[PDB]
Structure 1
Amino acid sequence: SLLNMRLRNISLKSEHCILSSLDFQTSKASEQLTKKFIYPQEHNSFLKLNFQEISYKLIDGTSQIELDPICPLKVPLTAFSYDSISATFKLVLSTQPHRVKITLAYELELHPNLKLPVRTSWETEVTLTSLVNSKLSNVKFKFINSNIKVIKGEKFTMRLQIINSSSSPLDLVVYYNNTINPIPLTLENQYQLHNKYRKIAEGIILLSNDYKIPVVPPRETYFADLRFIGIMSGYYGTLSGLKVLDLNTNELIEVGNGASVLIQ
């Protein structure tokens, strides 16, 4: 069994999937057995595994279905000593764990006469922000296009969705802060922090600053049509400064976390 393998699947909430990535490599048993019977008299020998077929199958009860990989995987692939080949599969995702089967059909090719077949297999289970809500309230916020790319200098528009279902209309007011946040750390980290705060402060401007969103009646929605223009090339992932104030309980929720402006 010189095919030690692993499954280190990682979740991805952004696109709503889980990426399962098998990775099989020649184990230390191959190193131990290479200089024992494969080619004892030679000094630097190697194995010559050939993989007939690799299957990643989704199973539920008696039914099974094969899953194709993300990028193509040339099936009749060769393999020598000290190799590690990995394949990735995408399956869309609550509390219903999946059941999958992995089967590798391969054969060693000691001389071009004989081929020992192997059909190792085993089953297992596939087991292991953009939307922002308001604390001490039920109102919820989401940008229609949180991922916007525009040429720097040109003014762009970002559509903010408001959900109201709590009890009563809100009088929230939105603004962008264009002042350098005072710094609180060594000189290195402190200057990094200052540069980040400066870039946040004087990078983007909201051309409708201090917009009074008029009314958001209960159990309804509203589109705050914010309008911006950028002046510094860069990537403003989860931009701060765009914070919305609620004029009922002085909430200073950071609504800008669901914005990923990129400008050249």
Structure 2
Amino acid sequence: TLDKYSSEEILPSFEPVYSWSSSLLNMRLRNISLKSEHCILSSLDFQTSKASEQLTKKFIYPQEHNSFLKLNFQEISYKLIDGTSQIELDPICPLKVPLTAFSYDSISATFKLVLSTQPHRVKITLAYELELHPNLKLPVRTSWETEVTLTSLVNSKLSNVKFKFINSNIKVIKGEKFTMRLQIINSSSSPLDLVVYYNNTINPIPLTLENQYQLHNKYRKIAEGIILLSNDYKIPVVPPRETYFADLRFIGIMSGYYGTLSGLKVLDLNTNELIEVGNGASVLIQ
């Protein structure tokens, strides 16, 4: 609008028109995995922080020699997020969700969730209220997001054959003959002639006496705790890309917990391996 502006410009007086020349509580999450059950236990834990102790005697109750807070947790929510999605996740044990708490307190909550290359996204929301005197109450609605960041099957060396017991965990009264089905998955190239055997021999010890006798007792218990009624078994044939059930029969004579039992070691009669398949068994004989 230069024309309409310059036409509204106020011309000066005595001049020609134109001239040519010129944080009460602190909290964390200590999740732990479990490949035994293919699950991760995410355990949050929140405790009254040192700031609460500092402010106890400054404003809340300065005249008292020893005061304590009255934080009432109205809700402790654990949720999983996937974009806009949001779903609650219950805890293992019940939690009395209107939970009263005083100074120097700490509460833990453990949530189980299924376990590769896709980390989770968890929202933890604490809504509580400090309950100074019966009448007035100061609420807080804090929340925050993060990510859930952090043996039974046995393989063979220099091959691809795989071993597993159908029931790795079994309990049975002492002296009753039982059985554990050893599945032998062959997929490499060719049939095997592997042979199973159990040696009831005290392995020679290699150290103070406290370690030495512990170690000797360990081998003695291993050697003469359990026996295999089908020792020196010839597994008949396991053709390639097939499975076999080396059904074994045992009996125990010395009560205990033979977790990852040794002695039982199937050896391959093709390259003289000593693959220790005993690690897949966790017998408990009463």
TM-score category by the smaller chain?
over 0.9
Match of 1:62 in 2: 84
CA distance in 2, matches of 1:3, 1:131: 43
Identity of aligned residues (%): 100
Q: Secondary structure at the match of 2:25?
A: coil
CA distance in 2, matches of 1:75, 1:86: 13
Q: Secondary structure at the match of 2:174?
A: coil
1:6 equivalent in alignment to 2:28: yes
1:239 equivalent in alignment to 2:261: yes
In structure 1, which of residues 170, 173, 185 is the aligned counterpart of residue 192 of structure 2? 170
Once the two structures are TM-superposed, the CA of residue 2 in structure 1 deviates from its matched residue by: 1.4
Q: Secondary structure at the match of 1:4?
A: strand
CA distance in 2, matches of 1:230, 1:78: 52
String of CA shifts for 1:158-200, please: whole Å, max 9, x gaps. Answer: 0000000000000000000100000001111010000000000
TM-score by length of 1: 1.00
Unaligned runs of 5+ in 1: none
Q: Secondary structure at the match of 2:86?
A: strand
Q: Secondary structure at the match of 2:193?
A: coil
Match of 1:121 in 2: 143
In structure 1, which of residues 187, 193, 207 is the aligned counterpart of residue 209 of structure 2? 187
Once the two structures are TM-superposed, the CA of residue 7 in structure 1 deviates from its matched residue by: 0.5
More strand by share: 1
Q: Secondary structure at the match of 1:190?
A: helix
Q: Secondary structure at the match of 1:244?
A: coil
CA distance in 2, matches of 1:171, 1:65: 53
How many correspondences in the alignment?
264
String of CA shifts for 1:5-55, please: whole Å, max 9, x gaps. Answer: 010100000010000000000000001000000101111100000000010
Once the two structures are TM-superposed, the CA of residue 205 in structure 1 deviates from its matched residue by: 0.2
CA distance in 1, matches of 2:227, 2:187: 30
Once the two structures are TM-superposed, the CA of residue 121 in structure 1 deviates from its matched residue by: 0.6
String of CA shifts for 1:222-258, please: whole Å, max 9, x gaps. Answer: 0000000000000000000000011000000100000
String of CA shifts for 1:114-161, please: whole Å, max 9, x gaps. Answer: 111100110000001000010110000000000000000110000000
CA distance in 2, matches of 1:10, 1:245: 36
CA distance in 1, matches of 2:232, 2:192: 16
String of CA shifts for 1:32-86, please: whole Å, max 9, x gaps. Answer: 0000001011111000000000100011000000000000000001000000000
Once the two structures are TM-superposed, the CA of residue 3 in structure 1 deviates from its matched residue by: 1.4
CA distance in 2, matches of 1:121, 1:68: 17
CA distance in 2, matches of 1:238, 1:76: 45
Structure label with greater radius of gyration:
2
CA distance in 2, matches of 1:3, 1:29: 8
Q: Secondary structure at the match of 1:243?
A: coil
CA distance in 1, matches of 2:48, 2:76: 16
TM-score by length of 2: 0.92
In structure 1, which of residues 212, 215, 223 is the aligned counterpart of residue 237 of structure 2? 215
1:141 equivalent in alignment to 2:172: no
Q: Secondary structure at the match of 1:245?
A: coil
CA distance in 2, matches of 1:210, 1:4: 61
